[PDB]
Amino acid sequence: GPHMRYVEIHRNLKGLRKYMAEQAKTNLKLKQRMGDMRREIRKSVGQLTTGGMAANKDKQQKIKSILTEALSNQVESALVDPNNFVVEPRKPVEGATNNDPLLPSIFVYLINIFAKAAISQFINEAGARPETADPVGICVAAILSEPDFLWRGASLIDILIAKFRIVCPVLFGYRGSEKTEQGRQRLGWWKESGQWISEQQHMDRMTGLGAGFAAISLRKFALSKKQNPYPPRFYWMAMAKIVNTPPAEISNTQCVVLKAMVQNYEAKFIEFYGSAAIAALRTALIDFPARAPHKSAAVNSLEVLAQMLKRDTGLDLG
Amino acid sequence: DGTLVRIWMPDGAPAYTADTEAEDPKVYEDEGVKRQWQSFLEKGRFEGGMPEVPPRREWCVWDF
Ligand SMILES: O=P(O)(O)O[C@H]1[C@H](OP(=O)(O)O)[C@@H](OP(=O)(O)O)[C@H](OP(=O)(O)O)[C@@H](OP(=O)(O)O)[C@H]1OP(=O)(O)O
Ligand SMILES: O=P(O)(O)O[C@H]1[C@H](OP(=O)(O)O)[C@@H](OP(=O)(O)O)[C@H](OP(=O)(O)O)[C@@H](OP(=O)(O)O)[C@H]1OP(=O)(O)O
Ligand SMILES: O=P(O)(O)O[C@H]1[C@H](OP(=O)(O)O)[C@@H](OP(=O)(O)O)[C@H](OP(=O)(O)O)[C@@H](OP(=O)(O)O)[C@H]1OP(=O)(O)O
Ligand SMILES: [Zn+2]
DSSP states (O other): OOHHHHHHHHHHHHHHHHHHHHHHOHHHHHHHHHHHHHHHHHHHTTTTTOOHHHHHHHHHHHHHHHHHHHTTTTOOOOOOOOGHHHHHHHHOOOTOSOSSOOEHHHHHHHHHHHHHHHHHHEEEEEEGGGGGGGHHHHHHHHHHHOOOOOBBOOTTTHHHHHHHHHHGGGGGGGOTTTSHHHHHHEEEEEETTTOOOOHHHHHOOOOOOOHHHHHHHHHTTTTSSOOSSSHHHHHHHHHHHHTSSSSOOOOHHHHHHHHHTTTTTHHHHHHHHHHHHHHHHHHIIIIIIHHHOOOOOHHHHHHHHHHHOOOOOOOOEE | EEEOOOOSSSSSOOOOOGGGSOSSGGGGHHHHHHHHHHHHHSSSSOOOOOSSSOGGGGGGOOOO
C-alpha cells in the first residue's frame, strides 16, 4: 500500500540522483549548471529559518526561478516518467497545465533536492527552535503548489512525504520499542556512521520533524488561487494514529512527536476543525498521557502543554 | 483565563472546503465511520478514542 509505494519512491529518488551524475559525464550543459542549481536551492532553503517575511519571499522566488529553468530543460537532461515518484499513477486531466507523460530529470531531481533541504532544516534547526519550521513549511507549500510545477493536476509532494516516512515513521502509524533494535528501526531512530545516535539527539530530530510535519499539513489556501498540496486531513489522520495506540505500545518517541505537532499549531488546528479539534486535543493532551503506563518526562510534557493552553490561551480541554 | 475567553474571531464558520474532509467522501456512509463519530455528535467529545477519518464540516461548530 502507501508504505510500499513511499519506500519505492524513496529508492527511485536515490537512483535518480545517481543517474544525474552519470548524465553529467556526457552532457556538458548539464555538468555546467547542475551543481550551481543544487547549491542555490540548498542555500536559499537554509536562509528561511533566519529571515523575515520579505526576505523569505525573495528566497522562495529564487527557488521558483531555478525550478522554472529546470522545467524548460535547456540543459537537455533525460526525461523520466513522473509516475515513479507519486503514490498513485496519474492519467491526463482536462484543463491541467502539464499533462505530459514525461518530465525533465533535472526538474524532478531538484524537487528532490528541495525536499531533502527542507527535511534537513526541520532536523537541524526546528529540533532546537520548533518555531523555525513554519517558514520552511510555508516555502514548501508555496513552491509545490505553483501551477507550473503541477503534474497532471496535482503536486509532486509525494517526493517530500516519501522522505518524511523514512525519518519520522510514527507520523504514519508505526510503533516500536525504544529498547529493541527492531523497535528503534521502526521508530526511525537514526544512526551516525553505523552507531545509534544518542537519545537526546533522537528526540531533537523527532521534535523538528513533528513541527515540520505540522508546518506543511496545517497551511491555509482559502485566500489563495493555489490548491493546498497537503491539506489538513493528513494532519488529523496522523494525530489519530498516534493517540489511539494501545497503552503497552506507547513510546516517548510518539509523545515527543505529538507535542511538536501540537504546540503553536492549536489555533490553526481549530480553524480547520473547530469543536472537533477541541475534542481531539483533549484526547491528545489529557486522555493519551493519562493512559500511558510509563510516566516519563515526555508523557508529562503533554500534560504541561494542556495546563499552559488553559492558563495562557484560556482553552479548557477538561 | 479568570473570565470568559473568546477563541473564534470571524463572523461565522469558515467557508466550506473539502481539504479538511476525508479524501473520499464515500467513507462517511460506512457503519464504522458513523460509529466512531456517533459519540462526538451526541456528547461532543471522544470516548473510544479519536476517529481516524476527519469530520464532515457540518459536524463541527466554531461558536466558542
Ligand atoms: O536516508 P538514507 O536511506 O539513510 O539515505 C541517505 C540519505 O539519502 P535519502 O535522501 O535518499 O534518504 C542522505 O540524505 P540526507 O538525509 O542527508 O538528506 C544521503 O546524503 P546526501 O545528503 O549527501 O544526499 C545519503 O547519501 P550518500 O551515501 O551519498 O551520502 C543516503 O545514504 P545512502 O547511500 O544509503 O543512500
Ligand atoms: O560527501 P558526503 O559524504 O555526501 O557528505 C556531505 C558533505 O559533508 P562532509 O563533507 O562534511 O562530510 C556536505 O558538505 P559539503 O561538501 O556540501 O560542504 C554536507 O553538507 P552541509 O555541510 O552543507 O550540511 C552534507 O550534509 P547535508 O545532508 O546537510 O547536505 C553531507 O551529506 P551526508 O553527511 O548526509 O551524507
Ligand atoms: O498564488 P497566491 O497563493 O495567490 O500568492 C500570491 C500571489 O503570488 P505570485 O506573485 O507568486 O503570483 C500574488 O501575486 P499575483 O499572482 O496576484 O500576481 C502575490 O502578490 P504580488 O501581486 O505582490 O505578486 C502575493 O504576495 P503578497 O501577499 O506579498 O502580496 C502572493 O501571496 P502569498 O505569498 O501569501 O502566497
Ligand atoms: Zn545529507
